[PDB]
């Protein structure tokens, strides 16, 4: 969208990944599988949670009786009351709807952010030991068993340990 | 007056609040509908009335 990851180069979502909002799909011989990155997902849940709880919990409301009843020689008062009520209703309607719109856009952009930043996190670890295949996917030059994958996931990857094999496999490509 | 509940006459109803220490005095030679029961209350604040069949 605003960062070109969700609905951008990553065409769609993974219905099989239930561990969270953001995650990984690996393809080492040992087998495939889906996982979630609980760090970014958890930070996103905390942020969004705080947003919603900030749009709700911030509404102070004193004890108030909106209704006022007037007679037939108090039409000025009755129309003044009507004017107050209608004014507040206008304000809250407008500001409420625009708030929902604007912050919905902001939320979607926030997810798009998290995914792009995650992709870049992986990219900066694999500079020459892999190529950018398709979209939201890297192909390795050295074979990366489960342990290695779970290494990319928790940040620690150890690049020079696999740099040589990669240097070989890359030349002919 | 036009018959309302079949009555050409009327009674105009009146009320007031009597704060502690103060004294209310009625005087009349006729046409008075005296009070029988009054209501000793403490106030409360800021509410309204509801008109529904719920």
UniProtKB/TrEMBL annotation, chain B:
The chain holds residues 233 to 286 of 565 of the full protein. Signal peptide: none annotated. This is Hemagglutinin HA1 chain.
């Amino acid at each position: 969208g605003l960062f070109g990851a969700i609905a951008g180069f990553i065409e769609g979502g993974w219905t099989g990944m239930v561990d969270g909002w953001y995650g990984y799909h690996h393809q080492n011989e040992q087998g495939s599988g889906y996982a979630a990155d609980q760090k970014s997902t958890q930070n996103a849940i905390n942020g969004i949670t705080n947003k919603v709880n900030s749009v709700i919990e911030k509404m102070n409301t004193q004890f108030t009786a909106v209704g006022k009843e007037f007679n037939k020689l108090e039409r000025r008062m009755e129309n003044l009351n009507k004017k107050v009520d209608d004014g507040f209703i206008d304000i809250w309607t407008y500001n409420a709807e625009l708030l929902v719109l604007l912050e919905n856009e902001r939320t979607l952009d926030f997810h798009d952010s998290n995914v792009k930043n995650l992709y870049e996190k992986v990219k900066s670890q694999l500079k020459n030991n892999a190529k950018e295949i398709g979209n939201g996917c890297f192909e390795f030059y050295h074979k990366c068993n489960d342990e290695c994958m779970e290494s990319v996931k928790n940040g620690t990857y150890d690049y020079p340990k696999y740099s040589e094999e990669s240097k070989l496999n890359r030349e002919k490509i | 007056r036009p018959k309302v509940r079949d009555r050409e006459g009327r009674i105009n109803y009146y009320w007031t609040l009597l704060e502690p220490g103060d004294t209310i005095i009625f005087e009349a030679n006729g046409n008075l509908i005296a009070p029988r029961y009054a209501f000793a209350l403490s106030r409360g604040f800021g509410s309204g009335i509801i008109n529904s069949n719920a």
